[PDB]
Amino acid sequence: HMLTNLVAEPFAKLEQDFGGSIGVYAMDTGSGATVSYRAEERFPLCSSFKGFLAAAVLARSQQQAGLLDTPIRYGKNALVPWSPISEKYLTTGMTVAELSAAAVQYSDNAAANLLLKELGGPAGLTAFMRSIGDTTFRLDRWELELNSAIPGDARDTSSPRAVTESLQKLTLGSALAAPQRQQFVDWLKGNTTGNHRIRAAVPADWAVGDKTGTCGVYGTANDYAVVWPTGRAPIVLAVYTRAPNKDDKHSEAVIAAAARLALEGLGVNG
Ligand SMILES: *[B@@]1([O])O[C]([C]C([O])=O)[C][C][C]1[N]C(=O)[C]C1=[C][C]=[C]S1
């Protein structure tokens, strides 16, 4: 309450220029100060669910020490459009860890569906999120159906706030054991798909891990990140967008701009 939105930022103008809705939640983990705009509205997860998927796999690996190095062979029928890594290993298979890294760092769709199967499907990932205290997250469908981003549909959505809170628990808090936590962080740090989103607002000399999503319809795209500014506590943040019309375009620039406003609202010099 008292530390939320101490400094107002022009999010409304930004989303109006975009032609849609922007949802932002950012927390300074040192002071507890927050920036919050549409933070409790639901937005489609799109590929951003794959970060939480990889965390759920790591949590399972705490009870199954051989899980991450298990080899997984798959057929051509497992390939889904946008499977840039797993298509190169169709004839060989990949380990669970490799599928997880591919899902996080390349948004690989086939990898994500294979790992969902390992966890018992969308309800199994939802159950993992409930287990860390996230009551907002829901995954309902598989790739590619979960990308429909229909206005008003709560399937396959969360809120910026719940995403940020869960990300904090998994990357900085105690939801994962220490080895698994650092592996999750390392996967996020190695992401390749986010250079034009939150990372574009973050100085190059700060560490950052992130996970993106792009539904392909309804102007719907997103990014969440942990950011380590030097000399102060980390910042966790989530930026989600959507728009009213199916043919509306997403904007990476709008995501980067919203992330800049969030950092400015927290008084984090960048
Ligand atoms: B996912 O929602 O988003 C990925 C891109 C990202 O992480 O920002 C691509 C795979 C998933 N999306 C789709 O399959 C539909 C597409 C949208 C743009 C390229 S593919």
Per DSSP, the residues of 116-156 read HHHHTHHHHHHHHHHHTT-SS-B----TTGGG---TT--TT
Residue 11 in tokens: 């999010």
Decide: 222 in ligand 1 pocket, CB within 6 A.
no
Distance CA 84, CA 89 (A): 10
Closest atom of ligand 1 relative to the 222 alpha carbon: 8
Amino acid at the residue 204: A
Q: Give me the resolution in angstroms, 1 decimal.
A: 1.0
CB atoms within 10 A of CB 5: 14
Query: CA 128, CA 122: separation in Å to the nearest integer?
Result: 10
Q: How far apart (Å, rounded) are the C-alpha atoms in residues 93 and 5?
A: 48
CA-CA-CA-CA torsion for 68, 188, 217, 198, nearest 10 degrees?
Answer: 180
Chain centroid to CA 183:
16
Partners of 226 in the β-ladder:
209, 236
Nearest atom, ligand 1, residue 143 CA? 14
* Domain 1-270 falls under CATH 3.60.10.10: no
Task: Report how far ligand 1's centroid is from the alpha carbon of 111 (Å).
Answer: 13
Task: Compute the distance from residue 189 Cα to the ligand 1 centre, in Å.
Answer: 19
Q: How was this structure determined?
A: X-ray
158 given a catalytic annotation? no
Measure Cα distances from 150 to 40, 100, 218 in Å. Answer: 18, 27, 7
Q: What one-character-per-residue DSSP string does the chain give? A: -TTBSSS---HHHHHHHHTSEEEEEEEETTT--EEEESTTS-EE-GGGHHHHHHHHHHHHHTT-TTSTT-EE---GGG--SS-TTGGGGTTT-EEHHHHHHHHHHH--HHHHHHHHHHHTHHHHHHHHHHHTT-SS-B----TTGGG---TT--TTEE-HHHHHHHHHHHHTSSSS-HHHHHHHHHHHHT-SS-TTTHHHHS-TTSEEEEEEEE-SSTT-EEEEEEEE-TTS--EEEEEEEE-SSTTPPP-HHHHHHHHHHHHHHTT---
Beta-ladder partners of 113: none
CA 147 to each of CA 5, 51, 141: distance values in angstroms, whole numbers, following the listed order: 31, 16, 9
Closest by CA to 143, choosing from 76, 71, 83, is 83
Q: After which residues is the chain discontinuous, taking C to N > 2.5 Å?
A: none
Q: Where do we find the tokens 């840039």? A: 84
The answer to whether 234 touches 270, Cβ cutoff 8 Å, is no
Instruction: Determine whether the shortest distance from the Cβ of 142 to ligand 1 is under 6 A.
Output: no
CB neighbours of 55 closer than 8 A, spacing ≥ 6? 128, 170, 175, 176, 184
**Cβ distance 5 to 34 under 8 Å?**
yes
If you measure from the C-alpha of residue 5 to the centroid of ligand 1, how many angstroms do you get, rounded to a whole number?
32
Of the candidates 133, 135, 105, 103, the one whose C-alpha atom is nearest the C-alpha of residue 119 is 103
Q: By the 8 A CB rule, do 48 and 213 touch?
A: yes
Backbone angles phi, psi at 4, to 5 degrees: -90, 130
Ligand 1 contact via 193 beta carbon (within 6 Å): yes
